[PDB]
């Protein structure tokens, strides 16, 4: 009961899951904690900043580059001056996306500080595009109203009174303007997939499924409809329910009050590999439903590659690998080199509203230091003719094979292997009906994955963090330097874990 | 017409204002650009990352600490493990606020990546406190409805039908539950001051006055009522207009439908020195209106010290200097040492809802690198018995005196000096009726301050950026190492500028 100033509830909970440890140094795929005697104990990191460390902890090339930038007196804070590195970074991502998609499209870049901040840049730019669409529609409706009032007052046409349910000339027009203004000021919707994770700020959290993370904040910001990824014959009907009309007058002899489409949906968000769903890759059938939706509503499709980008899936863009044709793209995690904080929103130049370049800004965005490190990260992942993607793919295959080898012999406690390249997960079978009270209680609290992670830490010196809404998945997203030995030690560790879980050995698994 | 991938509109605009320059190196209060010959031209930086650089660009102590942290293999990405540096940082801020306010209050710290992110942590925690208050109110209304239905059905009391406008027993209760649920799901309000700047993300931008920055995004998120800072006899009426009622039944013989207060305001936000208002310090009368409002509505008062904190005003907290008694505090800018990105929300432990420690999170938040640099920044500003605050105050006084000396002789084009410590500004008199076409056109576009900044750049090698919604203020927020010579050069530069503006020399001022 001494004074505590941060992290008491968080540390209490980590301690009870068996994850109460302090890492004092990190290098490559290894984090070190101190044992009772003050010796460094090495632990294999499969979490790696939730997929921030494609090149591992404190990669010597990234550290040396950072130290060189600082020794050179890089201008970190040069707001409202020419910062050509922003353009140079966007040029490279532009060239990479052209190469990987064969599409000769150009993208404007807006930088931020976090993946949620890049996603929110896209939500704002989306809303700018919806205000454009709205101004134009309302401009046409005024024209239609002028032309219907000219026809009606002169006597060239008569108002059809069978259409009057939908609301005297001047009065019916006022009632239309009142209905339309009501509709105009209603919040927009965003469309996401079930299990979607797009960040936890006031805007982005509404785009994040995890119910305890989101539902307390529901009232603050525009909501998302979470479209059922696996049951996509239903998406069509869910978005059709969300159609909203404005009113105008239609001239033919006869004038009629008629409904016209109002743009409600600001954007569609998608993860090429679904972090909050336990690393499920978007299927071709779903990609094609999202394309239909985007073409149908004429809002942008935002591809969140905060986690899937910068080579993780064995291409630079996972959207490119899985055929998702986005309008806007977002990057963060690995672009900071595992040491700094950087993010980018790529908005197709044919859609990009130039106001955004001067009405949106951030103190720290586009800083000199994270700009230099981004150019280094892009140089490293592009080096030697794209062989780094090849290494991700071959390490990814080796590690997926091990995970499948383990599932095949422990299918009683493992349902699936999910993901691609080095963004993988094991789905754990429900343990809410477990023999051991200790396990069953943890499973019923949504903690099972954390307990099991605890086991792997204390018994095998392997750092794993769960994913998914009830910690029903074990994440494996290590560096492209993961060795065959480290993969064998992980296999050993998982056979041990899934053998104890089979045996319902609650005393060994739960403290 | 070559391909461009970022910043084309932004660079076009900076070029036309005469601010089209690239700074290649920075040290202390100096930024260097390259002249036509490729020689370094030194420029005095009065912008300093909008007040991020209390210790200047690339302070040797901060650079050396950062290089040591990187060479030690700092664990940057240790998510969901014990990170004691978070607690150690919060301990120090806690001790500093106690010392400066004499209040023995304790604060929980939640870290983020940007000032907007810290402000949005506070908006979310505010909304968590409003959901608590709402659950409790609705719990009591159910009880009052049970007790009114028991009284009415048994016959112990009769329903008074003069109260029925506000909506048969069971039917009037359903109509109350329908009204109440409607109200429950409505967006909350935030209260801010006129000219308020709190960030530009989906949540925070609604809290930011600047109309072109905000009005396009109005539909996305809960709004702010911008309270008139100078006319605070009107605030009372503005907040009273925003009162909203729920309905219940009140038992006496007689049952009556009655209105009860619904909690609508999530939070009050304030800057101790108002960045978006041209560096106006909050007056005691306004501080006391904000205290009244907070005590009256029982929502938290959030003190945004993103810009005013870490010694800028001549104390660590500007709230402490000006007697603002906040519930939550936010810090960012200087805490990154001018090289990394870090922010913190301090929430009073008596109000702090422990769910927030586990339902809110961020990939980059609380990273090892910015944590080590924060501890260094806090060591430096606290060093040698608080003499750093003394130096801010004496440098601040010297620079304010020069700005007042300049206003006194150029009161035709300068209306006021605003701010405190090293967070100062000159208010420029309106130039929309200027003789020179060139000046008048720029003033009418809101660009006057940028034009003048251009002059100071090209004619005197001084970097100044404007503040305020029509760039009607010139900001001066340099490092505590600003020399007497640099202050003299700034005086010379401003006499020159304000003499040309007096002379309406549009050919010298506008390119
Ligand atoms: C796909 C995706 N989008 C957005 C964000 C938010 O980025 P941020 O603001 O944290 O820098 C994250 C973070 N994903 C990690 C936290 C995870 O699911 O473990 C992410 O995985
Ligand atoms: C008082 C205040 N609050 C919040 C923010 C947002 O912080 P961020 O997300 O940019 O890191 C800033 C930035 N203020 C600068 C931009 C200014 O007043 O010009 C700020 O000054």
Author numbering:
A (entry chain B), B (entry chain A): 6 to 172, 178 to 262, 264 to 522
Paper quotes:
CrmG catalyzes amino acceptor caerulomycin M (CRM M) transformation to caerulomycin N (CRM N). Moreover, the activity of CrmG is insensitive to inhibition from ketone α-ketoglutarate or pyruvate.
For these three crystal structures, each asymmetric unit contains two dimers. In the structures of CrmG with l-Glu or l-Ala, clear electron density was observed between the N atoms of those amino donors and the C4′ atom of PLP, indicating that we have captured the external aldimine for these amino acids. These corroborate well with our kinetic data that, Km value for l-Glu, l-Gln, and l-Ala toward CrmG is 80.02, 182.70, and 405.10 μM, respectively.
